[PDB]
Design an enzyme around this catalytic site. Structure first.
Site, mmCIF file in Angstrom:
data_model
loop_
_atom_site.group_PDB
_atom_site.id
_atom_site.type_symbol
_atom_site.label_atom_id
_atom_site.label_comp_id
_atom_site.label_asym_id
_atom_site.label_seq_id
_atom_site.Cartn_x
_atom_site.Cartn_y
_atom_site.Cartn_z
ATOM 1 N N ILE A 1 0.851 -1.186 0.000
ATOM 2 C CA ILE A 1 0.000 0.000 0.000
ATOM 3 C C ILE A 1 0.891 1.242 0.000
ATOM 4 O O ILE A 1 0.418 2.370 0.174
ATOM 5 C CB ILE A 1 -0.955 0.025 1.229
ATOM 6 C CG1 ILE A 1 -0.167 0.174 2.533
ATOM 7 C CG2 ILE A 1 -1.831 -1.220 1.261
ATOM 8 C CD1 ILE A 1 -0.927 0.842 3.645
ATOM 9 N N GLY A 2 2.188 1.018 -0.194
ATOM 10 C CA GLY A 2 3.170 2.088 -0.137
ATOM 11 C C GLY A 2 4.559 1.677 -0.592
ATOM 12 O O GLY A 2 5.072 0.615 -0.215
ATOM 13 N N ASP B 1 5.571 20.744 6.859
ATOM 14 C CA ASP B 1 5.526 19.943 5.640
ATOM 15 C C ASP B 1 4.287 19.077 5.485
ATOM 16 O O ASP B 1 4.385 17.877 5.202
ATOM 17 C CB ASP B 1 6.776 19.078 5.524
ATOM 18 C CG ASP B 1 7.125 18.777 4.093
ATOM 19 O OD1 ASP B 1 7.177 19.728 3.277
ATOM 20 O OD2 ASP B 1 7.348 17.593 3.777
#
Ligand SMILES: O=C1/C(=N\O)c2c(-c3ccccc3)cccc2N1Cc1cc(F)cc2c1OCOC2
Length: 346
Positions: A26-27, A144
């Protein structure tokens, strides 16, 4: 004994505690994340393999700060770490750290590819603002925020995966910039409201379904800002360092579009009267976050009293008890490996 099994996921070998099984990618772009079922707790989870986290000074800084802060921050909008572990037995052999957190359903990047009602949207933005508030109340300024780094659940609940910025690496991964505040881009110093720009950059993207100010470089990014918002005033530039101020003052000047123009009614769900009233406050609130000058940009608390946002205000949710160690630091590889491993074993 031997609680670990190795399994090839993607291009990687995940060696994990037996309790976690049927792992799904998933990443790759958090970096090697993986969805799992925890047999012990009987829910699904997300695991992240930090390949050799001490391999450089940046990774080691991010991994250390990830580790500590997640241990001693409990807010419902900051991702919960459930479990940390290393397959390796000794500091000499110590190579990887796996972080196991709870699982949501999707990226904020996917949410952005769809029409939302003002209720869902006022909710997401509310939550972002909470998490951020806790962070600021504990002295942590993020700097960020980005879609790739905010996760959401089917029932509209939302969490933030990282604690942001605290020098150089060589990866096939270019850091994303479009969400960074002017005061950060111009390196002029900052205060907490700096993530408010980042919040607004998102709201506007949610609403526009296109990254507001895209851009290959920090130069090209700033073109695209003032192009839309207009050149900032005198007072603002009275603050940028002579060397920066020069570059900035000598720039094609922009009148910049007033908010109604940038964000037409076309973009908003506004056909019932509720939807129309709402849209206007969306735009009043956008109009105040997207402000170049931090001097004249909306604080975190005011944002949470805003007519659009405050429909969900909760003292418990907002004003939760504040969250250890110094975190502006320097060490070498063999000292970082030392400190990451100490933080794992605990
Ligand atoms: O929920 C997460 C998540 N942690 O909860 C997560 C993480 C994560 C979670 C915990 C610790 C580190 C990274 C990293 C990337 C995405 C995450 N996503 C998004 C996500 C969840 C899912 F179930 C399926 C997909 C999802 O996104 C892409 O499309 C498939």
């Amino acid at each position: 004994d031997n609680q670990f099994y190795s399994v090839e996921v993607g291009d990687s070998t995940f060696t994990v505690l037996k309790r976690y099984q049927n792992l799904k990618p998933i990443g790759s772009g958090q970096g090697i994340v993986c969805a799992a079922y925890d047999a012990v707790l009987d829910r699904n989870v997300a695991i992240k393999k930090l390949s050799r986290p001490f391999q450089n000074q940046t990774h080691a800084k991010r991994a250390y700060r990830e580790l500590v802060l997640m241990k001693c921050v409990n807010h419902k909008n900051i991702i919960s770490l459930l479990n940390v572990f290393t397959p390796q037995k000794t500091l000499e052999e110590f190579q990887d750290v796996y972080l196991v957190m709870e699982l949501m359903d999707a990226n904020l990047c996917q949410v952005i590819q769809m029409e939302l009602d003002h209720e869902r949207m006022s909710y997401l933005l509310y939550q972002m603002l909470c998490g951020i508030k806790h962070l600021h109340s504990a002295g942590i300024i993020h700097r960020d925020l980005k879609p790739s780094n905010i996760v959401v659940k089917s029932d509209c609940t939302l969490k933030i995966l990282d604690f942001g910025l605290a020098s150089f690496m060589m990866t096939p991964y270019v850091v994303t910039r479009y969400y960074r505040a002017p005061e950060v881009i111009l390196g002029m110093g900052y205060k907490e409201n700096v993530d408010i720009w980042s919040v607004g950059c998102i709201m506007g993207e949610m609403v526009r379904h296109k990254i507001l100010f895209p851009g290959r470089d920090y130069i090209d990014q700033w073109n695209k800002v003032i192009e839309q918002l207009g050149t900032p005033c005198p007072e603002f530039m009275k603050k940028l360092q002579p060397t920066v101020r020069n570059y900035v003052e000598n720039r094609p000047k922009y009148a910049g579009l007033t908010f109604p123009k940038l964000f037409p009614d076309s973009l908003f769900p506004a056909d019932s009267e509720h939807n129309k009233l709402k849209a206007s406050q969306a735009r009043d609130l956008l109009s105040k976050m997207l402000v170049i000058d931090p001097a004249k940009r909306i604080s975190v608390d005011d944002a949470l009293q805003h007519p659009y946002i405050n429909v969900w205000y909760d003292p418990a949710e907002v004003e939760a008890p504040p969250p250890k160690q110094l975190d502006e630091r320097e060490h070498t590889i063999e000292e970082w490996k030392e400190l990451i491993y100490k933080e794992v074993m605990n």
